[PDB]
Symmetry: D3
Subunit: 26 residues, 6 copies
């Protein structure tokens, strides 16, 4: 498990969705 | 205007939902 | 096996269409 | 730090992709 | 101004072109 | 083989550079 620091709630939510997306693709 | 994006496969449907949500957060 | 994603606005519709095609190309590598 | 978050990421591949994507996002937002 | 991005593999080239299409639309 | 993608704008050049790296990471 890794931890990516994200400043800003906007980019946090988007990066969450992008992570979930990468998982779906894999 | 409301559009409907055709998508083949459950996997990509779910991804595009997340990408659509991400666009809306940016806009 | 076919799904439909409602999208508000032609601009996002067009963006998502290209993003879908990117996904499909990546998945075919 | 009230608006600073830590995204929990399973596996090193996705972690490194997400760092690139994060930087991409920040570039688009400037 | 015009830039050139080095890409290895024609498949990845086509993927990046599609991603570039997306990026330009998002920026309008 | 090596190709060169033409990109208008420094912004998209740097982004697409990051996207290329991401592609290569997924393909490893």
């Amino acid at each position: 498990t890794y931890y990516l620091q994200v400043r800003g709630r906007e980019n946090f939510e988007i990066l969450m969705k992008l992570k979930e997306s990468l998982e779906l693709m894999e």
